[PDB]
């Protein structure tokens, strides 16, 4: 439940996501 700007970027892991963005189940940063 970390703060994260909504963007459509495919994540290969949470660390792949900017800031405190997490890798959503659909495989995007959220």
Q: How far is 7 from 14, CA to CA, in rounded Å? A: 14
Method: NMR
Residue numbers of the domain that contains 12: 1-30
- Which residue has tokens 């459509």? 8
CA–chain centroid gap for 24, Å, is 6
Partnered with residue 23 across adjacent β-strands are 29
Q: How far is 6 from 17, CA to CA, in rounded Å? A: 11
Q: How far is 27 from 30, CA to CA, in rounded Å? A: 9
Here the CATH number for the domain that contains residue 5 is 4.10.75.20
Number of domains in the chain: 1
State the DSSP code for 16. G
Q: How far is 15 from 6, CA to CA, in rounded Å? A: 16
- Which residue has tokens 């963005």? 21
State the DSSP code for 23. B
Q: How far is 30 from 25, CA to CA, in rounded Å? A: 9
- Which residue has tokens 């996501």? 17
């Amino acid at each position: 439940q970390r703060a994260c700007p909504r963007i459509l970027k495919k994540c290969r892991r949470d660390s792949d996501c900017p800031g405190e963005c997490i890798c959503k189940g659909n495989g995007y940063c959220g």
